[PDB]
């Protein structure tokens, strides 16, 4: 805290409480006994725990029928209207499209819309899986995920 | 009928103007006017000006016939205080409070 180490007043004789510096935590404009520091909140999670959680969430999705497996899912052109129609006809609004191979058309179509997101099989997170109500899977993506899980 | 009148930021202190206000509290307009006129206080004229303002407001902005008018509600209140520093002995510094008071006069026929 910017200031001076000089005592506000002499230690004895004054009719005021003992003080050592204006920077004391019990003084206005300066203090904080325990100031926060830049710290890393990253938590160490074992690969086994991560795999187990991913398998458990996938099993829960399958049991609740929120996971859907389909054939090649692609959009002919990078137009959001085509993706919107292809989702509305199939009756899906909040769904995650996981594809074995990322396609620029689908990526551009889904980038703007928030209810629909696109991620690769390798790039999957339990937080996203739980957040998304529905999940649509391609055959190649399912095979890759199963191979990775082992 | 309210016909209120007040003089905010008055120099006179509320503690010293309440004494004058009590004399006219609940008396007829003419009696209060003469009492304030012949009272030996600065607050006397200070509140006589407010009473004149109130009676003029009653005459113009409200009903005429000031004869049947009484000062029903009158009260003196403190106002913002100004801080002044007065040097004292031994280098000690004290603070002088220049007190101001708000005076309100309400006159009604009934």
């Amino acid at each position: 805290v910017t200031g001076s180490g000089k005592k506000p007043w002499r230690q004895k004789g004054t009719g005021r409480a003992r003080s050592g510096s204006i920077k004391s935590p019990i003084w206005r404009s300066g203090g904080v006994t325990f100031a926060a520091r830049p710290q890393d909140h990253s938590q160490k999670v074992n690969k086994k725990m991560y795999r187990g959680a991913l398998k458990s969430i996938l099993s829960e999705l399958v049991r609740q029928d929120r996971l859907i497996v389909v054939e090649k899912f692609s959009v002919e052109a990078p137009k959001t209207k085509l993706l919107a129609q292809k989702l509305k006809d199939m009756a899906l609004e909040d769904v995650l499209i996981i594809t074995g191979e990322l396609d620029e058309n689908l990526f551009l179509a889904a980038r703007n819309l928030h209810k629909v997101d696109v991620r690769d099989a390798t790039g999957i997170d339990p937080v996203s899986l739980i957040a998304f109500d529905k999940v649509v899977m391609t055959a190649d993506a399912v095979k890759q995920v199963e191979e990775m899980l082992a | 009928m309210e016909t209120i009148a007040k003089h905010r930021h008055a120099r006179s202190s509320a503690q010293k103007v309440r004494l004058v206000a009590d004399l006219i509290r609940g008396k007829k307009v003419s009696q209060a006017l003469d009492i304030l006129t012949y009272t030996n206080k600065k607050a006397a004229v200070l509140v006589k000006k407010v009473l004149e303002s109130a009676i003029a407001n009653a005459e113009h902005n409200d009903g005429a016939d000031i004869d049947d008018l009484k000062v029903t509600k009158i009260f003196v209140d403190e106002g913002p205080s100004m801080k002044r520093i007065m040097p004292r002995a031994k280098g000690r510094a004290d603070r002088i409070l220049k007190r101001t008071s708000h005076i309100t006069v309400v006159v009604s026929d009934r």
Partner: peptide, 17 residues
């Protein structure tokens, strides 16, 4: 609204020895 900077030293205590 500055706090009094200078305060005089206390009057010496009466001899209580």
């Amino acid at each position: 609204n500055n706090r009094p900077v200078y305060i005089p030293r206390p009057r010496p205590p009466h001899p209580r020895l």
